[PDB]
């Protein structure tokens, strides 16, 4: 239960903060959990989603499909996978928007900042 006077349980305020969140804050909101192999390897539970990350779909009609993150559409609160698309009647193909909470990260794109974040969260 809530124990602080600086946090509010008002439903109206919570929804307004979510839909009007700036781009930097939507990055934290768009986090995905790691796989069992990566959870043991690094020692952390979840990370914010990043482009060029290998993911697996674990919910919805696209369950079982894999791919790489080709676009993080923060404005739409969604991500797009390179090989997860829909074919229109005219023959054109459009990406399918997926929520990162319904995905599982199977491979991480690593650089200097990502490694420091992992060590900052107590990972190895």
């Amino acid at each position: 239960a809530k124990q602080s006077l600086d946090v509010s349980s008002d439903r109206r305020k919570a929804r307004k903060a979510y839909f009007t969140a700036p781009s930097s804050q939507r990055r934290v909101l768009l986090s995905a959990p790691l796989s069992k192999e990566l959870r043991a390897q690094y020692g952390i539970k979840a990370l914010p989603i990043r482009r060029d990350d290998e993911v697996l779909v674990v919910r919805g009609s696209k369950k079982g499909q894999e791919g790489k993150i080709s676009s993080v559409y923060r404005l739409k609160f969604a991500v797009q996978v390179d090989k997860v698309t829909k074919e229109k009647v005219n023959g054109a193909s459009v990406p399918i928007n997926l929520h990162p909470s319904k995905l599982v990260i199977t491979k991480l794109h690593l650089d200097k900042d990502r490694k420091a974040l992992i060590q900052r969260k107590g990972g190895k």
């Binding site: 239960a1 349980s9 008002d10 439903r11 109206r12």
Partner: protein, 207 residues
């Protein structure tokens, strides 16, 4: 708002123009012009008898009469028929009132607190609270009252050495000091027969 429905310079047209004598908005060129105003029967008007803040909200109750109700509620907790009729699952409870050891006041973890409560026969009452969670049936859902559930056991102690924190997260379970018992908890909804679990120290202190 005290100004609601009166932010208008509307004035009655009087008789002779084949319309009702209600005040009407002046001017022209907007559609709002000529419409009724200031009336409780008019769209955009003022409600009849607008609500005021100086309505009586709190109610005085005599101090001795208040204690009479509290004593009646405490005595009702010792009657098995009243406790059962209030919806508590005390069918196979050995003895009412139920008194447990004083060491319950020193439990620090939620896991062991639940295990102790289940061991004395409160398992069925705890399961009732979990299975009764429901969505509210009206416009109170988006007024920060979204879910409803039943009331569980009440645990009464003499000294708090961790029991309050250990049971804080358990749904339907509330703790009360023996010295400051609350009628709102002893007879929820003005219904006697709350399931109360007393510690040994609290039971002695009742005298």
């Amino acid at each position: 708002s005290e100004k609601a429905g009166h932010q208008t310079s509307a004035e009655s047209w009087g008789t002779g123009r084949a319309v009702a004598r209600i005040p009407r908005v002046g001017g022209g060129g907007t559609g709002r012009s000529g419409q009724g105003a200031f009336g409780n029967m008019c769209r955009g008007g003022r409600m009849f008898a607008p609500t005021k803040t100086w309505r009586k909200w709190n109610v005085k109750v005599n101090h001795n009469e208040k204690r009479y109700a509290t004593a009646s509620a405490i005595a009702a907790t010792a009657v098995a028929s009243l406790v059962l009729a209030r919806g508590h699952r005390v069918e196979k409870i050995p003895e009412i009132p139920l008194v447990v050891s004083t060491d319950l006041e020193s439990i620090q973890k939620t896991k062991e607190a639940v295990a102790a409560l289940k061991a004395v026969g409160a398992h069925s009452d705890l399961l009732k609270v979990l299975k009764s969670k429901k969505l509210r049936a009206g416009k109170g859902k988006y007024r920060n009252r979204r879910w409803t559930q039943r009331r569980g056991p009440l645990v009464v102690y003499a000294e708090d050495n961790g029991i309050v924190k250990a049971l804080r997260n358990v749904p339907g379970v509330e703790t009360a000091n023996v010295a400051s018992l609350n009628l709102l908890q002893l007879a929820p909804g003005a219904h006697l027969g709350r399931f109360v679990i007393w510690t040994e120290a609290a039971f002695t202190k009742l005298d």
